[PDB]
Design a protein around this nucleic acid. Structure first.
Ligand SMILES: [Mg+2]
Ligand SMILES: [Mg+2]
Length: 150
RNA sequence: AAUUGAAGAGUUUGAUCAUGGCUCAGAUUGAACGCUGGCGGCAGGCCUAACACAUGCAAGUCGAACGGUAACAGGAAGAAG
């Protein structure tokens, strides 16, 4: 259950006396299929170095998520920079419908049957991220009683 | 048992994030044109000039309301082929 996938890879330019010096960037997501997900950025002058350097970053920076079966307890909202995202339990029809990009975090992270949608900018670095934070804030379907109870 | 269902992409920049229009993948059609065209079932077929119209047909029927015989069908005292 290693499970990992990169979401977006990109080129960027730096500009010096002698011209443009380019380089790449990688955005990755890793999860165990049972909660726990992280993302990593990491950039590098060549692609495989960039994705490698990323998968790593993702290994740490990993948070976990109070799932509830294969789905989410309550419908959650997330938002970071321009990306404002929303996903919903969905008493699984089949489920797992989202914009490949946050399907990526969902998938690996173990959620099996949601419906999701991203608003604002589809800028991956911020949507995958608005989502993680999304699932993170999402609170425990009983440690809400822990919360109250008293 | 019986609406239990929601995805994003391209494009301003050297590059970036934001803002923001343009564009694209989808469904839908009483459709047209271009190329092509085998058979069948159901359906659809002037969206325009409420423009103008040759010709046929689209409202009759009842002799058990009525006087009726002009047509054709028979029959009739009786005149005959
Ligand atoms: Mg340019
Ligand atoms: Mg032809």
């Amino acid at each position: 259950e290693l499970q990992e996938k990169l979401i977006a890879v990109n080129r960027v330019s730096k500009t010096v006396k002698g011209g443009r010096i380019f380089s790449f960037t990688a955005l990755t997501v890793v999860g165990d299929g049972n909660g726990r997900v992280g993302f990593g950025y990491g950039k590098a002058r060549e692609v495989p170095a960039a994705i490698q350097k990323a998968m790593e970053k993702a290994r740490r920076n990993m948070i976990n998520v109070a799932l509830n079966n294969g789905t989410l307890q309550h419908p959650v909202k997330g938002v970071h920079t321009g990306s404002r995202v929303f996903m919903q339990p969905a008493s699984e029809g089949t489920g797992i419908i989202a914009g490949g990009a946050m399907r990526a975090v969902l998938e690996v992270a173990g959620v099996h049957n949601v419906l999701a949608k991203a608003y604002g900018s589809t800028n991956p670095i911020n949507v995958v991220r608005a989502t993680i934070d999304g699932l993170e804030n999402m609170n425990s379907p009983e440690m809400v009683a822990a919360k109250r109870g008293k």
